[PDB]
Design an enzyme around this catalytic site. Structure first.
Site, PDB file in Angstrom:
ATOM      1  N   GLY A 191       0.834  -1.203  -0.350  1.00 29.67           N
ATOM      2  CA  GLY A 191      -0.350   0.387   0.079  1.00 29.67           C
ATOM      3  C   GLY A 191       0.947   1.120   0.523  1.00 29.67           C
ATOM      4  O   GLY A 191       1.803   1.149  -0.110  1.00 29.67           O
ATOM      5  N   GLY A 192       0.093   2.283   0.201  1.00 27.39           N
ATOM      6  CA  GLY A 192       1.044   3.854   0.363  1.00 27.39           C
ATOM      7  C   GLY A 192       1.386   3.771   1.421  1.00 27.39           C
ATOM      8  O   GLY A 192       2.669   4.512   1.362  1.00 27.39           O
ATOM      9  N   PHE A 193       1.185   3.084   2.871  1.00 26.59           N
ATOM     10  CA  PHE A 193       1.700   3.663   4.245  1.00 26.59           C
ATOM     11  C   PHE A 193       2.973   2.645   4.826  1.00 26.59           C
ATOM     12  O   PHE A 193       4.108   2.302   5.507  1.00 26.59           O
ATOM     13  CB  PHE A 193       0.770   3.732   5.329  1.00 26.59           C
ATOM     14  CG  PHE A 193      -0.039   4.681   5.717  1.00 26.59           C
ATOM     15  CD1 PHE A 193       0.304   5.461   4.064  1.00 26.59           C
ATOM     16  CD2 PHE A 193      -0.564   5.210   6.614  1.00 26.59           C
ATOM     17  CE1 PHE A 193      -1.002   6.768   4.020  1.00 26.59           C
ATOM     18  CE2 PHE A 193      -1.812   5.855   6.719  1.00 26.59           C
ATOM     19  CZ  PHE A 193      -2.128   6.789   5.047  1.00 26.59           C
ATOM     20  N   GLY A 194       2.572   1.085   3.853  1.00 26.28           N
ATOM     21  CA  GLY A 194       3.685  -0.224   4.004  1.00 26.28           C
ATOM     22  C   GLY A 194       2.802  -0.985   2.892  1.00 26.28           C
ATOM     23  O   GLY A 194       2.614  -0.733   1.747  1.00 26.28           O
ATOM     24  N   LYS A 225       1.648  -6.931   8.667  1.00 28.32           N
ATOM     25  CA  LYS A 225       1.826  -5.521   7.814  1.00 28.32           C
ATOM     26  C   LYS A 225       2.194  -4.809   9.367  1.00 28.32           C
ATOM     27  O   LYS A 225       2.321  -3.991   9.963  1.00 28.32           O
ATOM     28  CB  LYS A 225       0.014  -5.154   8.389  1.00 28.32           C
ATOM     29  CG  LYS A 225      -0.212  -4.367   7.775  1.00 28.32           C
ATOM     30  CD  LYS A 225      -1.836  -3.954   7.161  1.00 28.32           C
ATOM     31  CE  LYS A 225      -2.577  -2.244   7.439  1.00 28.32           C
ATOM     32  NZ  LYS A 225      -3.919  -2.475   7.121  1.00 28.32           N
ATOM     33  N   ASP A 269     -15.827   0.975   4.791  1.00 28.47           N
ATOM     34  CA  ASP A 269     -14.607   1.230   3.645  1.00 28.47           C
ATOM     35  C   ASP A 269     -15.559  -0.585   2.850  1.00 28.47           C
ATOM     36  O   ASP A 269     -14.364  -0.766   2.407  1.00 28.47           O
ATOM     37  CB  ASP A 269     -12.853   1.288   3.311  1.00 28.47           C
ATOM     38  CG  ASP A 269     -12.754   1.945   2.584  1.00 28.47           C
ATOM     39  OD1 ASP A 269     -13.212   2.860   1.788  1.00 28.47           O
ATOM     40  OD2 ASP A 269     -11.098   1.373   2.104  1.00 28.47           O
ATOM     41  N   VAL A 273       2.641  -5.192   3.949  1.00 19.28           N
ATOM     42  CA  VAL A 273       2.710  -7.089   4.707  1.00 19.28           C
ATOM     43  C   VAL A 273       2.839  -7.849   4.153  1.00 19.28           C
ATOM     44  O   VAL A 273       3.620  -8.248   2.458  1.00 19.28           O
ATOM     45  CB  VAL A 273       1.383  -7.190   3.839  1.00 19.28           C
ATOM     46  CG1 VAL A 273       0.316  -8.208   4.940  1.00 19.28           C
ATOM     47  CG2 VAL A 273       0.135  -5.949   4.215  1.00 19.28           C
TER      48      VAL A 273
HETATM   49  O1  LIG Z   1      -1.073   1.298   2.950  1.00 21.85           O
HETATM   50  C1  LIG Z   1      -2.484   1.110   3.380  1.00 21.85           C
HETATM   51  C2  LIG Z   1      -2.204  -0.042   3.938  1.00 21.85           C
HETATM   52  C3  LIG Z   1      -1.675  -1.422   3.060  1.00 21.85           C
HETATM   53  C4  LIG Z   1      -3.006  -1.750   2.358  1.00 21.85           C
HETATM   54  C5  LIG Z   1      -2.107  -2.829   1.173  1.00 21.85           C
HETATM   55  C6  LIG Z   1      -3.169  -4.047   0.711  1.00 21.85           C
HETATM   56  C7  LIG Z   1      -3.482  -2.668  -0.156  1.00 21.85           C
HETATM   57  C8  LIG Z   1      -4.140  -3.362  -1.488  1.00 21.85           C
HETATM   58  N1  LIG Z   1      -5.813  -3.720  -0.591  1.00 21.85           N
HETATM   59  C9  LIG Z   1      -5.146  -4.633   0.437  1.00 21.85           C
HETATM   60  C10 LIG Z   1      -4.746  -4.046   1.625  1.00 21.85           C
HETATM   61  C11 LIG Z   1      -4.071  -5.241   2.226  1.00 21.85           C
HETATM   62  O2  LIG Z   1      -3.250  -6.475   2.497  1.00 21.85           O
HETATM   63  C12 LIG Z   1      -3.673  -7.547   2.552  1.00 21.85           C
HETATM   64  C13 LIG Z   1      -2.518  -8.414   2.415  1.00 21.85           C
HETATM   65  C14 LIG Z   1      -1.568  -9.192   3.158  1.00 21.85           C
HETATM   66  C15 LIG Z   1      -2.190  -9.520   4.232  1.00 21.85           C
HETATM   67  C16 LIG Z   1      -3.023  -8.421   4.630  1.00 21.85           C
HETATM   68  C17 LIG Z   1      -3.553  -7.517   4.043  1.00 21.85           C
HETATM   69  O3  LIG Z   1      -3.669  -8.978   6.360  1.00 21.85           O
HETATM   70  C18 LIG Z   1      -3.447 -10.203   6.085  1.00 21.85           C
HETATM   71  O4  LIG Z   1      -2.765 -10.603   5.489  1.00 21.85           O
HETATM   72  C19 LIG Z   1      -0.929  -3.374   1.616  1.00 21.85           C
HETATM   73  C20 LIG Z   1      -0.283  -3.436   3.146  1.00 21.85           C
HETATM   74  C21 LIG Z   1      -0.684  -1.709   3.704  1.00 21.85           C
HETATM   75  F1  LIG Z   1       0.055  -1.316   4.334  1.00 21.85           F
HETATM   76  N2  LIG Z   1      -3.927   1.919   3.619  1.00 21.85           N
HETATM   77  C22 LIG Z   1      -3.011   3.609   2.993  1.00 21.85           C
HETATM   78  C23 LIG Z   1      -3.894   3.929   2.734  1.00 21.85           C
HETATM   79  C24 LIG Z   1      -4.121   5.608   2.074  1.00 21.85           C
HETATM   80  C25 LIG Z   1      -4.265   6.693   3.122  1.00 21.85           C
HETATM   81  N3  LIG Z   1      -3.723   7.594   2.464  1.00 21.85           N
HETATM   82  N4  LIG Z   1      -3.615   7.664   1.604  1.00 21.85           N
HETATM   83  C26 LIG Z   1      -3.687   6.161   1.429  1.00 21.85           C
END
Ligand SMILES: O=C(Cc1cc([C@@H]2CCNC[C@H]2COc2ccc3c(c2)OCO3)ccc1F)NCCc1cn[nH]c1
Ligand SMILES: [Mg+2]
EC number: 2.7.11.15
Lengths: 62, 339, 630
Positions: free
Chosen positions: C170-173, C190, C287, C175
């Protein structure tokens, strides 16, 4: 308390009704006692090391 | 009223006692003893140091053999020492940390102790098996145990913060006689050589003479300005000494029913914790909160010597029955044996 | 690997738990490790309790039985059984009334999973009292104390996880797939970057994610990515979650293309139970969209990222929070309050995208954010003729603009959605147990399957994350229970037996704390003068008037009196909390404890004991300080 104060009276009456001797005689008796026992008093009349359990000696009983 | 009048007759009885005491005061001990030689300079060395308590010592008591002694400490133990070798014959961890006093039975079969648990605990020193066991927990006081002394293996006298003393039957665990009369914490007691009488010293600044068998207060002695912390019979049973927070010791005579002598010095301002006579009664030894033991000529009132071997309060002391030594116990956690 | 502290840890822990009201039948019996040790105690060491607990476990197995035929068979076996007879044989049998209720439902052939619930309640009323107090006295409570010491001293870092391939970005990090080293359990990590969070002003977002995960992570929901742990390092926030390595549904929609009615029905059923869990805890998700639906290695799904979720038990939210093509009317209107209503509308939008390829309010690929909203607020949606009638009834149900008409808001929640014609084929218990075959089994090792469509750290930055670390007690206890509990207990049992024999050959009973008035005892490390001494580990005994300590192979030979202690303070020495005791004569005594509860308890006990000792000593003429100068 009236029971307490009567108890104090009875008590003081017991204390008052005793035979007392003259100080001069009481004092002479203490002096005579000390004098009769002066030579058997090791803190007063320090003993030879050989009679003193706490000097020059390792071998004891019991 | 009745209460108005009972107070007034009490006061009048106190005046008659005072008047009859004065009528007996024909001369002083000090005048009577002017002709005897001074004892000279009493000087002793430390012959043993007894090490092993881990905190303040509060009390000590010699066995009748002039050899074993029992001490009690802030470390929550009694230690029974062989003074000749310095060996610990027993080390007894207590049920209550707050011990303040201890006693050696004349037979050597038991010790006792107690404190802020308000209990006088009795320890059997040689069981059937050969172990040290609590054999009795004497419960009944309503405040702390300040002193205790055995008459024999089945009877002990206690004094207490609850303002009473008592005689106990050890087998039944019961107070056989209660000695009531003090109006402040009783701090100390001493048994007459024949055990028909005992004296007590208290925080009401008085000492009292008690009949063991009949339960009454026979005589009351005043003059101290502050707490009496310690008391001890002169060796023929006819007089006794006290030590007080007013920085004095005093000699009281039973048959004359009054104070004979004051032992003090303008340079000694702290309290006395402990008193005992030498075997003949000529020396009165007292422990002080200034870390010394001062040795007084009991007949003439002069200071004869000083034992200065502790780094904190001398809290207790005692002369052996054979007269050979004096033990001092201190807040510095040591006892010393001197002669 | 986990090493348990020694049994004397009980001296500190028992007290620490009693002070928090934590040593009751209810608090211990409902913890997984509490239950396991109590059971062990009852089955193996207390004859009067054993049949109660065996019966209790039979009923627990009965409760988990999937078919009515299985429960007809097993209820009859249980009633007609030896444990049932053992319990009439004892002088604490079941009541006439409970027996009547059970045997009445039995004879009329009806066997719900809670058939034996009045027996459970009677068992527990009898486990309460003396049997519980006997457990507390036993070595099994000691062992509970040992485990609990470990639970309450968890401080995770990166070095506690063997970390593997990236499974989401994602934007913040990112997984990652990872393994927790002490137990071998697999998880997702995460890992959110603090620099990147500062840059994009999403601090309240990271933090809200943690509070929301806490509200939601008990109960083992199979349909939400729940949290076991949160921790942080100087650059990273880290959430330890249910491992989902099958990629998200935004990616799978774009690869498979659109989904059939039957395929979407599998996804919807699973999602609906996830929402139910949340709404039962007064959490709105807000969401709901396919990028927030994740798949496991089997294709079962969970809702993830509660960053934008909110708690509505106290204050219903007003604000416009979501993604533009899935937000409900009552949300888009700022200063109109709303509850769980919002997720049911969002669900409708989402189940439409899986069928058609776009949200129902994004018509011709268009992005006019204002217009997407006007379509949600104004026109009802035409459903293409190709949708089944049952599917039409469902989306017309879920997409009502008025909350008061909308499926799932008429006052029975998820149960209204589950009753829809569209789901008539489903057994919802089978959905719950993940028994239905998923439509899409992700190819193993599938790369880039969960990507979204896309400066210094002050101490004030770090200060925002102060209360970020968290352990979910139930999650740690379950992890432990299902991996290492039994083996550690056996090893620990053998180690303690061995120290015991050796202690007795030596002539040593560890009995110094017994028969006295010792308040508490245990290991700490000590230091005096900083030049003369160094850290020495010793064994301490606190008594009402002093604190004694010993090395190994002797009784205590040193102490401080409560009298000498002037104050007890916390203080930092090299990133570690210690206790600083100021001692009369300007000396210092410093203590380091081995765990967080120990530091809390030694602090409280020392403080209490010195204050009480000093007020007492002052009233005792023979013990108090007396004047030595005028
Ligand atoms: O980066 C993230 C959170 C995040 C999301 C994701 C994925 C972004 C795409 N949709 C699915 C998300 C979740 O991905 C996962 C992938 C595997 C997982 C899991 C979650 O939990 C258990 O195993 C990966 C890393 C992350 F850190 N949120 C940003 C929100 C934002 C605010 N301003 N602009 C953007
Ligand atoms: Mg709104």
């Amino acid at each position: 308390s009236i029971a307490q104060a009567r108890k104090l009276v009875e008590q003081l009456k017991m204390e008052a009704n005793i035979d007392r001797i003259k100080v001069s005689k009481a004092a002479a008796d203490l002096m005579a006692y000390c004098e009769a026992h002066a030579k058997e008093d090791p803190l007063l009349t320090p003993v030879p090391a050989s009679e003193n359990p706490f000097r020059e000696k390792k071998f004891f009983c019991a | 009223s009745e209460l108005d009048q009972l107070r007034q007759e009490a006061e009048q009885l106190k005046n008659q006692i005072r008047d009859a005491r004065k009528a007996c005061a024909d001369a002083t001990l000090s005048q009577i003893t002017n002709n005897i030689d001074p004892v000279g300079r009493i000087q002793m060395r430390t012959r043993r140091t007894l090490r092993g308590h881990l905190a303040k010592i509060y009390a000590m008591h010699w066995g009748t053999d002039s050899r074993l002694l029992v001490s009690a400490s802030q470390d929550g133990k009694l230690i029974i020492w062989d003074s000749y070798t310095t060996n610990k014959v027993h080390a007894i961890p207590l049920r209550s940390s707050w011990v303040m006093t201890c006693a050696y039975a004349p037979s050597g079969n038991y010790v006792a102790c107690g404190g802020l648990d308000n209990i006088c605990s009795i320890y059997n020193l040689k069981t059937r098996e050969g172990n040290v066991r609590v054999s009795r927990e004497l419960a009944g006081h309503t405040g702390y145990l300040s002193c205790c002394r055995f008459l024999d293996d089945n009877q002990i006298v206690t004094s207490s913060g609850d303002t009473t003393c008592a005689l106990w039957d050890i087998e039944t665990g019961q107070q056989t006689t209660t000695f009531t009369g003090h109006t402040g914490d009783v701090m100390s007691l001493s048994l007459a050589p024949d055990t028909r009488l005992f004296v007590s010293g208290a925080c009401d600044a008085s000492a009292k003479l008690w009949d063991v068998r009949e339960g009454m207060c026979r005589q009351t002695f005043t003059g101290h300005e502050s707490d009496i912390n310690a008391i001890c019979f002169f060796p023929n049973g006819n007089a006794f000494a006290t030590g007080s927070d007013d920085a004095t010791c005093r000699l009281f005579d039973l048959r004359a029913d009054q104070e004979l002598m004051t032992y003090s010095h303008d340079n000694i301002i702290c309290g006395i914790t402990s008193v005992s006579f030498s075997k003949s009664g000529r020396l009165l030894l007292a422990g002080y909160d200034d870390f010394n033991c001062n040795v007084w000529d009991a007949l003439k009132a002069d200071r004869a010597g000083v034992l200065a071997g502790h780094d904190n309060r001398v809290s207790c002391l005692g002369v052996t029955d054979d007269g050979m030594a004096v033990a001092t116990g201190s807040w510095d956690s040591f006892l010393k044996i001197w002669n | 690997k986990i090493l348990l502290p020694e049994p004397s840890i009980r001296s500190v822990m028992q007290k620490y738990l009693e002070d928090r009201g934590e040593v009751t039948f209810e608090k211990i019996f409902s913890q997984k490790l509490g239950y396991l040790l109590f059971r062990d105690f009852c089955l193996n060491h207390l004859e009067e309790a054993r049949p109660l607990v065996e019966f209790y476990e039979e009923i627990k197995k009965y409760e988990k039985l999937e078919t009515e035929e299985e429960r007809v068979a097993r209820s009859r076996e249980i009633f007609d059984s030896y444990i049932m007879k053992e319990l009439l044989a004892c002088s604490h049998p079941f009541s006439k009334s409970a027996t009547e209720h059970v045997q009445g439902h039995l004879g009329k052939k009806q066997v719900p999973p809670d058939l034996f619930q009045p027996y459970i309640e009677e068992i527990c009323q009898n486990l309460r009292g003396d049997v519980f107090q006997k457990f507390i006295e036993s070595d099994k409570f000691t062992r509970f104390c040992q485990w609990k010491n470990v639970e309450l001293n968890i401080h995770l870092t990166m070095n506690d996880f063997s970390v593997h391939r990236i499974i989401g970005r994602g934007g913040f990090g990112e997984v990652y797939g990872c393994r927790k080293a002490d137990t071998g359990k697999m998880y997702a990590m995460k890992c959110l970057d603090k620099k990147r969070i500062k840059m994009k002003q999403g601090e309240t977002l990271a933090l809200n994610e943690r509070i929301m995960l806490s509200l939601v992570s008990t109960g083992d929901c199979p349909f939400i990515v729940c949290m076991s742990y949160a921790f942080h390092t100087p650059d990273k926030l880290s959430f330890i979650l249910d491992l989902m390595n099958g990629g998200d549904l935004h990616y799978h929609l774009s690869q498979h293309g659109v989904f059939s009615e039957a395929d979407m029905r599998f996804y919807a059923a699973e999602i609906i139970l996830g929402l139910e869990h949340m709404h039962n805890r007064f959490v709105v998700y807000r969401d709901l969209k396919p990028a927030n639906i994740l798949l496991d290695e089997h294709g079962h799904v969970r809702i993830s990222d509660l960053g934008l979720a909110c708690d509505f038990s106290k204050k219903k939210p007003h604000a416009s929070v979501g993604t533009h093509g899935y937000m409900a009317p009552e949300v888009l209107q700022k200063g109109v309050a709303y509850d769980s209503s919002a997720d049911w509308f969002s669900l409708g939008c989402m189940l439409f995208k899986l069928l058609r390829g776009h949200s129902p309010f994004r018509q011709h690929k268009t992005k006019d954010k204002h217009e997407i909203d006007r379509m949600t607020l104004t026109m009802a949606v035409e459903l293409p003729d190709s949708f089944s009638p049952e599917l039409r009834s469902l989306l017309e149900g879920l997409l009502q603009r008025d909350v008061n008409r909308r499926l799932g808001c008429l006052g029975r929640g998820a149960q209204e959605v589950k009753e829809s014609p569209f789901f008539r084929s489903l057994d919802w218990q089978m959905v719950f147990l993940q028994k239905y075959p998923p439509p899409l089994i992700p190819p193993r090792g599938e790369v880039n399957a969960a990507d979204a469509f896309d400066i210094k750290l002050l101490d004030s930055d770090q200060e925002l994350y102060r209360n970020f670390p968290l352990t979910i007690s139930e999650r740690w206890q379950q992890e432990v229970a299902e991996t290492v509990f039994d083996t550690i207990n056996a090893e620990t049992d053998r180690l303690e037996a061995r120290k015991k024999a050796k202690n007795k050959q030596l002539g040593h009973e560890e009995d110094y704390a017994l028969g006295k008035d010792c308040i508490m005892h245990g290991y700490m490390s000590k230091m005096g003068n900083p030049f003369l001494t160094q850290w020495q580990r010793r064994y301490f005994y606190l008594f009402p008037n002093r604190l004694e300590w010993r090395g190994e192979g002797e009784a205590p030979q040193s102490l401080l009196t409560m009298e000498e202690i002037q104050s007890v303070e916390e203080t930092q020495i090299k990133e570690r909390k210690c206790l600083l005791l100021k001692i009369r004569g300007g000396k210092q005594f410093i203590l380091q404890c081995d765990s967080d509860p120990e530091l809390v308890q030694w602090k409280k006990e020392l403080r209490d004991a010195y204050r009480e000792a000093q007020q007492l000593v002052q009233r005792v003429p023979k013990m108090k300080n007396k004047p030595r100068a005028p």
